[PDB]
């Protein structure tokens, strides 16, 4: 009985780190829910440790491709907007207006082909300031993204609201889920669970903020890789949601035209009402309390007497120096610089943010391809939660007491790293090896 | 393969310089190089060690400056996804030297999350006198 | 701020031996964020090594080097006439990054 | 009665009776080829483990016995410290670099068993 | 000498000698993805039934025996009225709602036959 | 210690000990559908041979014994000339036309054994 | 060919509910446009 | 030499030499390349 022999065991709870292919499960149309597996049933584990680590996972980098391929699939069979690149005779609509909106809302006229190729059609439309570029009385403007890209009109039948989907694993793989109250990026998890697939993950597109995301526990927690390093973004997560309200009070008109045989084009009509500017309202008291709470949370890493100073953005393109999101089918760009005022020392109104509208957008830097945004008829409103901010800090010398913090980011994976941080794909192996006193017969 | 920057411009004290560092020279090209790769700008004075000047991210051209050259350095790219620029206002007779632009993944790629400047491009010279 | 210094500033060697390019760090480098560059006067400064010890694409078998903590060494196996040029080491981490001063090999 | 992967943090002496909850779940447009790639990989990963257990004389069993002696160079641990304290995850990390020889050593115990029985059956 | 699915209407006592023709036919552009799904689905449907028979101690057999007793609450019929008058289609409809309780009960008889045989072989 | 397909020209009496190296290597964009068909074809070709060996009472074994006698009309060669002189490639060409009758005669020996064992175990 | 006859068995056959007459209706309209993809698009005829 | 049949003059004759013999050719013109934009998003590189 002393001479031990080796035995193999089938169906043994042991796993390894591996990457695999996740599929969709979610239960007119949207970009995602067209062909997915119809869907809880969790299993809790006890006193087993696991080294959870984000920013090196294989789930936030597969989703970054599974979102852009799904976006290209919803943009391929639509109408290709080739003949729009003509000379646009374009002047200022609503002249001598003493309001703020002066440079935008330009009226341009151009020729467009119809179903009969020998005949043309003169059409009138309104385009924003970020949609027309002058080229060398009325001036002759052209499109913004024509000389380096080919714009395609998006399909008006599909919608752009984020339907919550689930990334689900096949047989042989599992998803470890950390169920800790406080949990930073890299480290052990005291209580894990084995899940097939997760809760509602909203694939919302947003920069400089985290709209309609998952909530947190009773305390605000910050997350970074090596936060003394000022190169990685700081993914904070608020404990209570703060609401932002913005509408578009100009009454819209959407007019239809036929550019060719079988195709269609929905363009901007007139404005029947008042020429106003869209603006997002936030409550000042709870936002100031949230800023004080996240400053008190961030003060646990840099001592007591260090002056934390919130500042505005650095610059670059429009998707970092402003905040961009998607409301109902329209893409907004608001400056949000009224939320990062003067600094913080230890010893009933509403804040408005001016927000503009750009039709031609270019998401995920697809060179050679661009999408057109059709207008939405009527007044459209959007109320949104804010669960999480995107902050980064700068460097400095040794004698520096004013630690600055600017809202940057811009990475689309950071919006999916605040909702897939507590999940980890894992591959189980059913072959176990153990010695015992057993011996087979002859 | 290699990056391309041109310019042998002389300058006067009190002006601004513009250095464009493009990848694949033909203008109508879609390299996609300025798209998933960070880009470092590095100055070097003759008889002096080279110092860092500024990195630009490939996500939406969000720049990260240093504290020495903060208030007088703007840099971004145009509407096309090539040809990042370098505008250094507030000149001085101290920064006379060569300039370099290098490609760097900066730990954002899929294999191994490395930290290396795999290719440097050209190297222009900026002098200033009166 | 971590200052990066190099004590062998002037070096001279014959073609066909091993040379040691040492570098001292200030306070506790992370042993995975360091790079070496081969500079020259009016040429293209290329890279020779990744991190601690990992070769690049255009790098032969004769280039290597290791080190951890605050000391980092570059160990060239053999000396060629196409390698007599100055070398510059740099680190990574918090902005701004700082180079390692400067060293130079020579023929004698 | 623990569930799928329920005894992963338990003792190896207590996890040897719940081997069926992990052995029965190994088999159970853009997404047209995404869902098809997993149904081939799971079947291949199940069939590889079924082929590895078929050439050891353990095809159809969960806890089988072999004639290969356990060497002391792989692990110097006794019986009272493995099946009473260690879990199945801590034991796999100790013999992780010895899997490629034992899987060879379990092969020669098969061909030396089927041949020496074969001339026993020809008499 | 009946053929594939030839004894589907015969007696269960006479259809137990022709189980081989139903167990050997389970494995044997627009149409590029249509033909590829069938070769995955048939392999998966065969491997599911091969996995369900491998964890019951019946891997490699057709008519095996178990130790689970037959409860009288499922059916009150005797041996003389099942294997002499009823076919398989009329028998499958009578115990169609008791399949999920037998398939678990056949599982716990495996480890109970595997654990008690383990320590008997360790002596 | 020969390798994969190393004993292909060797003696059948000497190649019967190296049956492990051939039984373990059966499992291990324009090219997106080209690589997907090959794994499905390999899985089907492995599962067909695993199904043919599971209905003969030889599941999990490499060298098994059957009850079907060897007819003299298939080959008139003795034992001293088959396992000493001929290889497997020269032997497969001699019974290349008598495969489907041996494959049919091997199927009834499973049922004629299983029914008798079921009648013996019912007492 | 190669048919197999059966005895002593009845089956509840039912048309207007089968999944074969609704799969063929999709397979025909999915094969109709496949023979029109490499052909010439008749765009400039509408004069 | 290799062929399907030597006496059949319809099949090709593939020969294989024992030593590699070199062949050098250049294009001695400079052949500058110019570009033009043919439409939205495309490119056209023509002869200079
Ligand atoms: C973060 O999350 C929050 C969630 O809290 C998001 O906020 C919501 O965002 C959605 C975006 O889709 C908003 O939905 C839109 O609401 C529009 C306003 O309609 C409301 O007012 C009318 C007034 O009569 C009510 O009737 C509506 O009630 C409807 O819903 C209830 C639900 O029970 C039904 O019972 C009713 O019968 C109504 O059906 C709303 O309260 C609304 O117009 C809009 O609907 C258009 O789009 C859909 C999808 O395409 C069409 O099916 C529909 O017919 C509408 O179509 C328009 O365009 C076509 C173009 O041809 C025209 O022909 C039509 O006439 C019409 O003009 C849509 O449903 C929602 O209001 C909003 N708030 C709340 C509290 O839910 C944030 O957006 C999100 N932030 C992000 C993602 O950044
Ligand atoms: C994140 O970045 C920080 C800052 O670079 C890293 O901390 C550094 O860690 C090293 C050890 O790997 C420390 O070096 C040690 O220094 C002491 C003397 O101070 C010496 O006695 C030791 O033998 C060792 O060399 C270094 O001091 C430390 N730097 C700071 C500022 O604390 C850290 O490793 C990085 N990674 C993480 C947190 O995962
Ligand atoms: C967002 O708001 C800020 C603050 O109002 C704007 O910053 C102004 O920028 C101009 C440009 O030179 C300065 O002359 C002003 O002094 C700045 N304002 C203040 C109060 O300092 C900024 O332009 C706005 N827009 C964007 C896109 O950031
Ligand atoms: C494509 O068109 C855009 C829009 O005009 C060009 O962007 C402008 O380029 C000029 C070059 O003299 C700059 O002065 C402007 O500041 C640019 N406008 C911006 C950045 O909004 C772009 O250069 C064109 N691309 C070409 C010709 O390749
Ligand atoms: C984990 O919990 C189980 C019962 O829940 C217990 O038997 C076991 O000893 C525990 N392990 C440790 C290391 O405490
Ligand atoms: C449309 O074409 C006619 C043809 O001559 C031209 O006169 C007119 O100016 C064009 N329209 C615009 C807006 O340029
Ligand atoms: C995460 O939190 C734990 C708990 O205090 C700590 O030990 C660990 O160092 C933290 N890791 C990081 C990267 O902040
Ligand atoms: C925003 O909209 C919500 C919707 O109910 C409303 O309760 C709230 O008063 C509005 N204003 C602010 C400042 O939150
Ligand atoms: C924000 O909250 C703090 C609470 O510490 C309070 O002192 C301060 O007056 C509030 N308002 C502003 C504008 O900081
Ligand atoms: C900063 O102040 C808080 C007050 O609660 C204290 O707990 C903490 O220890 C202080 N930080 C340092 C580094 O002393
Ligand atoms: C923030 O508010 C203060 C209050 O007076 C104001 O002075 C400052 O200009 C504001 N910040 C911005 C960016 O407008
Ligand atoms: C906008 O214009 C339409 C056009 O008929 C009108 O019916 C509607 O009342 C107007 N106002 C709003 C708020 O939609
Ligand atoms: C914001 O969060 C609260 C928290 O429960 C939720 O009730 C509300 O619906 C959220 N608002 C949204 C999703 O617009
Ligand atoms: C079918 O039924 C008849 C009488 O009902 C019986 O004689 C016969 O054996 C049965 N089976 C077949 C295969 O005909
Ligand atoms: C060609 O021939 C030379 C010398 O005969 C040889 O060195 C070389 O490897 C050959 N192949 C190529 C591709 O140059």
Residue numbers in the entry:
A (entry chain K): 31 to 57, 66 to 77, 81 to 140, 149 to 185, 187 to 309, 312 to 321, 321A, 322 to 398, ...
B (entry chain H): 2 to 35, 35A, 35B, 35C, 35D, 35E, 35F, 36 to 52, ...
C (entry chain L): 1 to 27, 27A, 28 to 107
D (entry chain J), E (entry chain Q), F (entry chain C): 519 to 546, 569 to 663
G (entry chain R): 81 to 127
H (entry chain G): 272 to 309, 312 to 321
What does the paper say about this structure?
We selected antibodies 561_01_18 and 561_01_55 (hereafter referred to as 1-18 and 1-55), two representative members of clone 4.1, for further analyses. Both antibodies are highly mutated, with heavy and light chain V gene germline nucleotide sequence identities of 68% and 78%–79%, respectively. To determine binding of 1-18 and 1-55 to the BG505SOSIP.664 trimer in the presence of other HIV-1 bNAbs, we performed competition ELISAs and detected interference with 3BNC117, N6, and VRC01. However, compared with these VRC01-class CD4bs antibodies, a different binding pattern was detected for 1-18 and 1-55 when tested by ELISA against several Env proteins. For example, whereas 3BNC117, N6, and VRC01 bound similarly to YU2gp120, YU2gp140, and BALgp140 and were reactive to the V1-V3 loop-deficient gp120 variant RSC3 (Wu et al., 2010), bNAbs 1-18 and 1-55 showed lower (YU2gp120, YU2gp140, and BALgp140) or no (RSC3) binding to these proteins. Compared with the epitopes of the CD4bs bNAbs 3BNC117 and VRC01 (Lee et al., 2017, Stewart-Jones et al., 2016), 1-18 and 1-55 bury more surface area on both the primary gp120 epitope and the adjacent protomer, another potential mechanism for their increased breadth and potency (Chuang et al., 2019). Finally, the slightly higher neutralizing activity of 1-18 compared with 1-55 might be explained by variations in glycan accommodation. We detected no recurrent mutations at contact residues of 1-18 or typical CD4bs bNAbs, and pseudoviruses derived from these sequences remained sensitive to 1-18. These results were confirmed in an independent repeat experiment for 1-18 as well as for 1-55, another member of clone 4.1. In addition, whereas some bNAbs demonstrate binding to self-antigens (Haynes et al., 2005), we found no indication for autoreactivity of 1-18 or 1-55 when tested against HEp-2 cells.
Here we describe bNAb 1-18, a VH1-46-derived CD4bs antibody that exceeds the potency and breadth of most classical VH1-46- and VH1-2-derived bNAbs. To characterize Env recognition by the 1-18 family of bNAbs, we solved cryo-EM structures of 1-18 and 1-55 Fabs in complex with soluble native-like Env trimers and the V3-targeting bNAb 10-1074 at resolutions of 2.5 Å (1-18 complexed with BG505SOSIP.664) and 3.9 Å (1-55 complexed with RC1, a designed immunogen that is a derivative of BG505SOSIP.664; Escolano et al., 2019). Notably, at 2.5-Å resolution, the 1-18 complex is the highest resolution view yet obtained of an HIV-1 Env trimer. Both complexes contained three 1-18 family Fabs and three 10-1074 Fabs interacting with three-fold symmetry with a SOSIP-Env trimer. 1-18 and 1-55 recognized the CD4bs similarly to other VH1-46-derived bNAbs, including 8ANC131 and CH235.12 (Bonsignori et al., 2016, Zhou et al., 2015), with interactions encompassing contacts with the N276gp120 and N197gp120 glycans, the CD4bs loop via the CDRH2, the V5 loop via the CDRH2, and loop D via the CDRL3.
